[PDB]
Structures are given as C-alpha cells and as structure tokens.
C-alpha cells in the first residue's frame, strides 16, 4: 500500500470555543505508532505539541501546550484527535499530525495540515537548535550547506545520534529526508548528505535543483522536549 495521514478541513472558529481536529490513519497499523502533532504559526516554526500511544492512549506533551491541547485516539477508526480549548487568535496556525517510529524516532509520514482561524468574523533547559543561515538564496545547480547547532550533545543513551531533516516545500507539510545524522529516508536522492556529531551538524545538497526548494528545519529527538531549528528557505537568486 501506500500510507496516509488525512486530517479534516480548515476550521474557522470564534473566540472561546473548543476545536477538535482529527487525522484518520491509513495504510498502516494504526497502534503500532506513536502520533505525534505540532504547530506551525504563520511566521514558519515547527513547535511540537504532544505525543500519543494509540495503543494504550498515553500522552506526553511540551510543557507550552499542557492545558491547553489534548490528544486522544478512536482505534475503531483509526484516527487520531486533536483538541484545542479556550480558542484565541494566537492559536491561528496550520497544525500538522506525524506518524513517529520508534528505530529513527523520526516523523516518517505527515498529514497534510489543517489550517485554523479564530475569529469572530462571518466568513533542565530545552535544547536549542540554532539553523544557519536562516536564508540561502542560491543559482540552480550550485551546492548548498546548511548547519544545525545543538545547545548540547544530541547522543543518546543508546549511543545513536536523534538528529533529523526535514524539507518543507511551498504550500506542502514538511517531509522527512535525513534521520540519525546522515541517514536518507526512502525516495530521497543521493544529492542530500547530512554529517556531524555532538552539537554541530550539516546538510549538503551537492546540485540545487527546483524540487528542493522550500524550507529545511532540522530537528532533535534525543532529549524531551522535542524541538526544531528555526528554518533555512533555500530559494533561487
Ligand atoms: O529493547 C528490547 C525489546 O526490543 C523490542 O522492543 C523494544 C521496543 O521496540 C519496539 O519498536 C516497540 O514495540 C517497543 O514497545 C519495544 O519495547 C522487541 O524486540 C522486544 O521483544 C525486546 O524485548
Ligand atoms: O553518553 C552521553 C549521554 O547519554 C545519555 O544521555 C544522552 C541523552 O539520553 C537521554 O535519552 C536523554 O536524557 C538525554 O537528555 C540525554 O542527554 C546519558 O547516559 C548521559 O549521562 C550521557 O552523558
């Protein structure tokens, strides 16, 4: 098969009221999978809000969304849901639901965004990941570097190293191309590289063509919270 994440549609909704979104899982074994959601504002971060078991209905959540965001699951159905309570314009965003496994502890598969507007119209300290530059305008065909600084080591107990790329083109969710360092997911081409170690990190991409442009965050997963680089917009001159 093919796996899918289908979330429901844009939501316009007043101050004060609930909104609860949902994302139906398919292609997949829907218990088998933490879930995770993350916000984005429209400005460009990705900020995670919480994880669900779906198997026995655990959550964890970053301590910014505890009591405000809550998550469950309906496994009859496959879908997981999303509520948000006591809406305000600062919760106008597209919120993203992502499929986590467990031997990348990356977000492999991603629903397609719900775009949420309020509005009472008619119609130890988290790890930083610093991203650098945070815009590399380039010509096609030229090589392209980007770094990701950790505020402190992203090895694991484990040994392994949870840091991870994603791409997000123009008007897509983010995509997952690199996991672990320097890992390309399936599908991605051999252009994209990623290396380092400890705090310090890179992503090559050896010939700028059209289909990578869009914005990279990298991302860390070693420690809880989980958090984002701020985004690089690889764009042409
Ligand atoms: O760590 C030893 C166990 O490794 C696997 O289970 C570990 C985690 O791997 C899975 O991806 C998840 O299902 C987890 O819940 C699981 O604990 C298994 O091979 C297990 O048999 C080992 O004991
Ligand atoms: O060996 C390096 C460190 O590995 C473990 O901590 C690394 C990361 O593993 C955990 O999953 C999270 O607690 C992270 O916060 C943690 O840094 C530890 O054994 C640590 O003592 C080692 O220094």
């Known amino acids: 098969m093919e796996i899918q994440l289908q979330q429901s549609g844009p939501e316009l909704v007043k101050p004060g009221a609930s909104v609860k979104i949902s994302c139906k899982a398919s292609?997949?074994?829907?218990?088998?999978?933490?879930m995770l959601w993350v916000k984005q504002s429209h400005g460009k971060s990705l900020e995670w809000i919480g994880n669900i078991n779906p198997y026995y209905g655990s959550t964890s959540y970053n301590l910014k969304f505890k009591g405000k965001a809550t998550l469950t699951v309906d496994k009859s159905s496959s879908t997981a849901y999303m509520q948000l309570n006591s809406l305000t314009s600062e919760d106008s965003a597209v919120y993203y639901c992502?499929?986590?496994?467990?031997?990348?502890?990356?977000?492999?598969?991603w629903g397609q965004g719900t775009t949420l507007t309020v509005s009472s119209a008619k119609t130890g300290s988290d790890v930083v990941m610093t991203q650098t530059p945070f815009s590399l305008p380039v010509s096609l065909g030229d090589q392209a570097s980007i770094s990701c600084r950790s505020s402190?080591?992203?090895?694991?107990?484990?040994?392994?190293?949870?840091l991870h790329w994603y791409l997000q083109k123009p008007g897509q969710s983010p995509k997952l191309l690199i996991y672990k360092v320097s890992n390309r997911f399936s599908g991605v081409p051999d252009r994209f590289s990623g290396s380092g170690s400890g705090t310090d990190f890179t992503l090559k991409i050896s010939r700028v063509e059209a289909e990578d442009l869009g914005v990279y965050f990298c991302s860390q997963s070693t420690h809880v919270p989980y958090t984002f680089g701020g985004g690089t917009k690889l764009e042409i001159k």
């Open positions: 402190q080591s992203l090895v694991h107990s484990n040994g392994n190293t949870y």
């Open positions: 292609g997949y074994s829907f218990t088998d999978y933490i």
């Open positions: 992502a499929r986590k496994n467990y031997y990348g502890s990356s977000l492999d598969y």
